[PDB]
């Protein structure tokens with residue numbers, strides 16, 4: 019009875035990892051994720067230049083989830099590239115590096131420089147597409163032209179297996195369209211569903227105030243709020259992309275949640291808010307709980323139930 | 332101290348009503364909603380001919396919310412028109428009538444016929460824009476040209492103040508765009524934010540099965556999942572539509588949830604899932620709890636804090 023998996027030519031002790039953005043910004047964070055019993059880790063989404071990000075407060079959490087508008091604070095590509103090439107310990111677990119350049123040219127620049135480290139060290143690329151392009155255009159993934167563009171250019175510049183981080187979708191035509199676009203690109207080997215549910219508003223009743231400072235308090239939502247959304251999107255893409263892997267992200271707090279993500283078709287399972295709230299010790303709980311569910315049901319491997327959600331009739 | 336209000340030339344005992352879809356399909360349903368404490372009622376979205384809708388099970392609810400894919404079952408427009416014409420007791424409360432035709436033609440044909448009853452009785456039209464189109468093109472609200480067409484055609488045929496039911500948006504550019512369209516139409520006096528959060532999927536861990544039979548288990552989400560989403564949209568439309576009323580829908584289980592909807596800008600507050608779950612008694616509780624918050628803060632009127640949510644700095 020085990021949680022092991024081989025995929026994209028790497029071996030993983032278990033399906034669990036942090037979500038990009040959570041506990042992965044500094045050397046200190048990365049070293050902690052690495053010492054944890056997560057199956058893998060992903061670095062904070064970076065830009066070329068170091069960024070300070072938005073004014074604080076900019077993240078907040080509550081019993082049923084979180085809201086954030088961090089504005090992409092990170093130490094700069096050079097920092098994460100050096101961490102990938104010089105400091106990370108691959109014998110402990112695989113590394114993902116998430117890039118989130120503010121234009122297609124910034125993304126091409128970084129990936130060209132990432133390629134040789136990817137080849138030499140085996141670091142994996144997660145391209146963040148649930149990012150802004152020009153203001154007053156939808157973020158990149160809600161704009162299938164822009165998305166096609168970024169993917170051709172990044173496939174050309176990088177020329178290696180990478181994966182993509184998707185915002186959630188809510189309409190069948192969008193699922194149909196976005197999957198068709200993704201299927202045009204043999205090198206997109208994996209799809210992460212989903213990024214935060216965009217522009218929610220949390221209001222505090224005692225103070226009659228929004229709880230984060232940027233954007234008049236509008237920010238991305240994570241946690242329990244988003245589980246059924248995360249599952250629909252995992253399962254939509256798992257059904258429409260028979261040749262790609264789906265990574266589930268969204269509202270995982272328990273093994274049962276991880277179990278549901280996996281029945282929906284998830285290969286890896288990421289943890290954002292719950293990790294932020296609970297700290298890296300969460301990873302041992304998640305594993306035990308999922309293993310308990312598997313034992314009770316007679317499952318021995320993840321592949322026995324992955325994608326095996328049943329419909330009625 | 333009390334909660335009465337005046338809008339669109341009708342008096343309301345309080346700002347609560349059912350959401351379209353819930354306890355509003357048969358004559359028995361509507362008679363019950365009328366005998367409740369709700370300030371108003373809306374009828375089930377209707378089509379010209381009666382519909383059986385989707386295979387059961389087609390609705391399910393859980394502690395954090397609900398999922399449905401009813402498929403628009405209804406007794407047909409003749410029935411709801413006759414209810415609006417001859418059966419409804421307007422001395423008890425205002426009535427809204429929701430129409431949700433499958434094409435613009437079906438919708439224009441309904442409204443020409445409803446126009447004279449509206450004149451004569453004062454029934455109000457809620458145009459459901461959050462419906463199929465589910466052929467090959469996105470649904471109407473997520474397709475701004477189709478949205479402009481239905482609005483032009485309908486305001487032509489109806490020629491009276493009416494309102495539109497909106498699905499949620501998740502992007503600043505879409506709020507800017509959707510809002511600009513609605514502002515093209517002086518006859519649209521109210522915007523209801525929001526309809527169910529489209530296409531989530533609820534999987535049950537024990538039986539490893541989806542919970543509803545149509546659309547392979549995919550359906551609209553209501554309840555506690557959607558509250559911060561319902562509040563971002565109320566407030567995004569509140570700020571961008573200064574000449575329109577905003578009606579909040581989504582995630583109301585308490586006086587507090589209603590309070591936050593109003594702080595966000597809502598004038599009427601709609602209850603769906605919580606009503607389906609607790610029954611019409613919910614209105615007396617919500618009234619009380621909302622009056623209780625007001626008293627503790629020394630607010631006398633909804634007008635005092637409607638829309639007056641604070642941002643930081």
Ligand SMILES: Cc1cc2nc3c(=O)[nH]c(=O)nc-3n(C[C@H](O)[C@H](O)[C@H](O)COP(=O)(O)O)c2cc1C
Nearest residue numbers: 037038039063212213214240241268269289290291
């Ligand atoms: C503080 C914070 C920072 C985040 N940063 C990123 C990021 O840099 N890149 C990214 O792709 N997603 C980011 N996310 C979204 C998470 O990666 C994840 O997609 C989302 O929070 C849903 O997961 P959860 O439900 O487990 O929180 C961030 C989320 C939070 C709460």
Ligand SMILES: Cc1cc2nc3c(=O)[nH]c(=O)nc-3n(C[C@H](O)[C@H](O)[C@H](O)COP(=O)(O)O)c2cc1C
Nearest residue numbers: 350351352376525526527553554581582602603604
């Ligand atoms: C069983 C069911 C039927 C519904 N039918 C309709 C409908 O016919 N027309 C409509 O505009 N919305 C319909 N809705 C959406 C609700 O009006 C409301 O927008 C949504 O449930 C979110 O509100 P809540 O969080 O209070 O449930 C329905 C919802 C449910 C649960």
Ligand SMILES: O=C(NCCO)c1ccc2cc(CCc3c(C(=O)O)[nH]c(=O)[nH]c3=O)ccc2c1
Nearest residue numbers: 063086087088089090091148149214232233238
């Ligand atoms: O300028 C911004 N925000 C306020 C001004 O409009 C801004 C800039 C870059 C951003 C970049 C992202 C992508 C990184 C990211 C963030 C994040 O760092 O804010 N939060 C998420 O939940 N998901 C994400 O993918 C999200 C929001 C951003 C907002």
Ligand SMILES: O=C(NCCO)c1ccc2cc(CCc3c(C(=O)O)[nH]c(=O)[nH]c3=O)ccc2c1
Nearest residue numbers: 376399400401402403404461462463527546551
């Ligand atoms: O046949 C349908 N679905 C199965 C796949 O085509 C179908 C047909 C008409 C529909 C019409 C609507 C509009 C009514 C509605 C419903 C509803 O009655 O299903 N549920 C909601 O949460 N919000 C709504 O606005 C919603 C879903 C529909 C699905």
